[PDB]
Amino acid sequence: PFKPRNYQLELALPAMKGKNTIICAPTGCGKTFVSLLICEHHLKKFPQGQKGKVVFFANQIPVYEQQKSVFSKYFERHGYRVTGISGATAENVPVEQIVENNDIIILTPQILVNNLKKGTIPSLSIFTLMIFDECHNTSKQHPYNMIMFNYLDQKLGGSSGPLPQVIGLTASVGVGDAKNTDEALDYICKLCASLDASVIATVKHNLEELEQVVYKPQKFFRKVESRISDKFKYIIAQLMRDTESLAKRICKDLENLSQIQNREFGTQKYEQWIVTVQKACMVFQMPDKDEESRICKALFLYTSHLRKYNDALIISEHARMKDALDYLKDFFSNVRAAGFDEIEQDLTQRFEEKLQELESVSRDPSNENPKLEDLCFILQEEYHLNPETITILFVKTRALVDALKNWIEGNPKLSFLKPGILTGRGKTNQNTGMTLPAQKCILDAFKASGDHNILIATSVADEGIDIAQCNLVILYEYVGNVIKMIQTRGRGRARGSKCFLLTSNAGVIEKEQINMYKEKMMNDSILRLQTWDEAVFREKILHIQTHEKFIRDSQEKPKPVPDKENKKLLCRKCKALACYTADVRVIEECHYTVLGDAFKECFVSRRAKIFCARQNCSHDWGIHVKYKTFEIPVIKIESFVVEDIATGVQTLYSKWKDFHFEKIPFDPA
RNA sequence: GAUCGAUCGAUCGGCAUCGAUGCCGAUCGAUCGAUC
Ligand SMILES: Nc1ncnc2c1ncn2[C@@H]1O[C@H](COP(=O)(O)OP(=O)(O)O)[C@@H](O)[C@H]1O
Ligand SMILES: [Mg+2]
Ligand SMILES: [Zn+2]
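The joint structure predicted for all components is written out below.
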């Protein structure tokens, strides 16, 4: 098998003494093997007749499966029962029967949180060792911190029997929210108090050997200047001005619906302003329901078109103009398909009047993004130096990931590249998402052998998944906190690797330099903490734990009183009566449906998605689901305005949990 | 293997109010229930 290195034995030494240790070491050095050695030493120290129980908390399903496989192939030779519980595990052989029948359990923290809050697992005393992978996640409300809250509530006050030894496997404590070394040390002490850790054991003696396994790449900042002559921006800004003039002509009070004063086209401030204006335009009352519906539908269309124009302007500055033009054309084609209206056809004609010159200015070699030119130059130079380079180019959004893939594929200069996509799971309003087997299939094809040369990921390829060692870590306008910096920089650990930060905004380079200074502060604070006496640090973390427990035990009132007044759900686009709250049945607190035949005449089905039934509204109301034996349609509260019956207020709600009303359970009879 | 609905958590950017609170957009992770 494997032979433990000297620094791997130095990192496991404080934890093999029985002390709660935070093992901070760079990515790719073998912290999983350190945890394996610690668990092997822990399970062997119990006398005959007694047995230890180790739990390993992983926060992701791929990481959970990988750690379960590793622990099973490593420990089932000794005769230990290794198991794993997750969300994909079938609801059989209950958890209290699994934990009691195994020695090593690979868990996700939410499963243990659920089993502790429901009373299945009464105490954490059934375990003798807890190993949190990526323990820097122990923070405000993370499930790691819920497990540690249970641990500390058992420790302080209600002193029950023995408590397990806690060990973390982070790579960066993340002093973030601090501005100097003292605040960084304070945050680090708070982190060791959250995990009840007294040692921050790092590699100090065998550092010449650790540097031969992992390599720290060289950071290079690339600040580019935005294009001076932007005619695409000119045309889209004229279209936005026309739409805004129409909306102001039909509303007359747009400048008082939001407090955004200085808003420019193509910014996030304008997006906030248009979202606020769209939300304020839905809550509109007047003693004329036809006029109210007409005004609200027209303002909905105007605000949606303005938001789409702003989205295209934001897309066109990080990618090609062809990408924003395709975004706008797809939006207009999909908005024509539902049903065209006088206002909507006027807007469509206004867009199509400028569509040809937009196509002409978008298909121009001179009007190309300078950021993309610098990216092409960097890729060309790197792949001319070493033609077997592999890149882990980091992107912020999924649309930009697809844009960069389509640009790399259609670039005559980047013919040596074979781009691969890696987005996160979970559907969105525009993208579908990548499942777990798709991510696994793409991650195995991206290696030094072939079948994939460059991976275009979005914040999913930097935390816990296993990727090949890259030689190029280009960050396409991608800056976060110090943890994200150390994580993305740690993706390329091959010898002689670079990490480029390409940006066109003076202030992002400053953010990354602040992150570097914060990493320096973090290292200095860890080194300063490692010199304290263990008793003084234990007293400090005990005082911190007592203070935080006192603060935490004073927040136990997060529950309002549910309302029972009758309220009507109207459409959000046309503001037509959809249904009443008295007809809304909820099945299992998650499947809010409508009971009645009057609602069946209000929606049209096109599983089958249900939309409004007005002349030209076609607003998405909900979807058909399949229960045990039923095919009832469920609705979404984010598609309706809630008007009171007695009063006339029309409050808006984002999710059903914000809407407090008398939710009657669904009954099939 | 492919989804649906609901919920939780973390991160970044932006906005409003008085460093804090609240909100919006984007990104990621996980959990409960149901279906093919
Ligand atoms: N003693 C060792 N000898 C050889 N290879 C090792 C040794 N320890 C660790 N490794 C390798 O280093 C890699 C580290 O992977 P992993 O533990 O997932 O990342 P990290 O250490 O950053 O958490 C493993 O794939 C393992 O094969
Ligand atoms: Mg790891
Ligand atoms: Zn409608």
